[PDB]
Design a protein around this ligand. Sequence first.
Ligand code: KPM
Length: 165
Amino acid sequence: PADHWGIDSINYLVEKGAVFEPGKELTRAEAATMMAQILNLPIDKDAKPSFADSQGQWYTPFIAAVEKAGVIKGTGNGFEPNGKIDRVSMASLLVEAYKLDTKVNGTPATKFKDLETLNWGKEKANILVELGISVGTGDQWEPKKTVTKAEAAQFIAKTDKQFGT
Ligand SMILES: CC(=O)N[C@@H]1[C@H](O[C@H]2[C@H](O)[C@@H](NC(C)=O)[C@H](O)O[C@@H]2CO)O[C@@H]2CO[C@](C)(C(=O)O)O[C@H]2[C@@H]1O
């Protein structure tokens, strides 16, 4: 929709063939697929990723591509392609895909109460904040909240337009 948020982002992604169901929650496999396409990675049809849990499905060669490019690791217990992706995992995808750690000077400050107490991925969220890719709300960044398709489009369109090649 025209005056609706996300439209310039989604058009950018459509223009680059990387993506309406904007409020739909995104799975980790769908996020990885958007990455594989925006990065223009080579997609070998029968290439398989390492992960036992990511075989035999439409997303499988896309996951293999972003694993080969170093963009995804597992969770440690596989890739969990059909689990919903949360914001801190999204951050991890973008930081790895675009080497965003080389785009900031030193270590970004922590600007949110709920990034301070985080088990993993604090640094990656802070980098997104530092780069203004995540605007962030008030005093909560909500690292474990799931990402919608339109929110993913914004993160990716914004990041790629700035740092893509
Ligand atoms: C192996 C590793 O450290 N992975 C990180 C992360 O790994 C977490 C566990 O989630 C996490 N497991 C749980 C159940 O929370 C574990 O406790 O700590 C690991 C880090 O020490 O998992 C992310 C999953 O999503 C992506 C995009 C991904 O690449 O799939 O990014 C991963 C991070 O790189």
